[PDB]
Design a binder for this molecule. Structure first.
Ligand SMILES: [Ca+2]
Ligand SMILES: [Ca+2]
Ligand SMILES: [Ca+2]
Lengths: 212, 212
């Protein structure tokens, strides 16, 4: 999952960027390389440690000016102040958050730490009902997950449950955003690659935080 | 899956090493780094391409003298001459070969391209019957694979069959080797990590090619 080019139409030179769910920091470091100041955020210290590791390795940059810092954070309770950031990126993050109420609380937090009229770049997987094998997985796991579009990712050799993944409907994603006072500025359905190599449909969205 | 230290008791300074099933070349490059001349072999050009890619990247070496070359090969029909190599490494390779007759033909080829009294370093996964989830997988897939210890690795999100994996019994591995005139010099049962992160028991073996 790379950064879609569209993001560069909305970024401005001195934007302070929050990367929510940075993992081991691929995207944060790519933005830093392009001259942006980015804070990469993640709940687990493992990922954050790896990210600061990667962040040392040199000669990466295609531009000057950027920097990347990483911090362990709980996205439904950010340490940062209101209006701390010019831009947020949320790439395949909410998909790993099993509680729909937890997801709104995260969006409210992003809204809070973003300045007025700041943009949010969001990429998520859609519910691929049209794909027989995904329809089957959704049908099979609903009785367990009890949420529509949430299913279990399983160990390939063993079939043991590893984690809960959620796929979104357009309606659901749109309202998650517009209920927290974002406006949709850019929206595409795209073919995305899952963390396991499947080609499925998802969404690329640029939302803008409304002025008070 | 790293190289077990034992290998360094059997390697000699100017050994020419064959790495069968080199993938993207992690192990070949590690041996090259340590000053060995190594040929990394793999059936698919993708892996080989990546390997020559990785092989360009610099500053890796902890010793001088080594080099790594990569070639697309079919292991049951090697292009190399008899007695071409002082040492062979076969790490989690045979596990991906679904035909037990194909596996003997590979061992015969390794025997052929190895010099008299050369060593073979082999690492493989054992049949973990003691692990309930592996016992269950073996039981479930036998009717499909029709080979004992062979099962299907499945897509984590979708459950679709990706590939056939084989786990070995000690008897089976021992005879695969001793039927082709190797003698077992070193043998350990170790806890290994699967390509998907499972901790299962397997084998580390140093076999020696018998003198004619
Ligand atoms: Ca499964
Ligand atoms: Ca796949
Ligand atoms: Ca696992």
């Amino acid at each position: 999952l790379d950064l879609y080019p569209i993001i560069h139409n909305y970024l401005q030179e001195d934007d302070e960027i929050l990367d929510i769910g940075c993992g081991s920091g691929k995207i944060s470091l790519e933005l830093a390389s392009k001259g942006y100041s980015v804070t990469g955020i993640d709940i687990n210290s493992e990922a954050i440690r790896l990210a600061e590791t990667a962040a040392r390795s040199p000669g990466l940059n295609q531009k000057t000016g950027g920097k990347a810092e990483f911090k362990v954070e709980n996205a439904s309770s950010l340490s940062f102040h209101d209006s701390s950031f010019d831009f947020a990126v949320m790439q395949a993050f909410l998909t790993s958050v099993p509680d729909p109420k937890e997801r709104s609380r995260i969006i409210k937090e992003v809204f809070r730490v973003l300045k007025p009229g700041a943009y949010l770049y969001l990429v998520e997987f859609g519910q691929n009902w049209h794909l027989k094998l995904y329809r089957k997985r959704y049908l099979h796991d609903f009785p367990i997950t009890k949420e529509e579009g949430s299913f279990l990712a399983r160990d390939p050799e063993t079939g043991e449950t590893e984690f809960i993944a959620h796929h979104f409907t357009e309606k659901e994603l749109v309202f998650l955003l517009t209920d927290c006072r974002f406006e949709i500025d850019y929206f595409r359905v795209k073919e995305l690659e899952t963390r396991t190599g499947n080609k499925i449909l998802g969404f690329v969205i640029i939302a803008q935080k409304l002025l008070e």
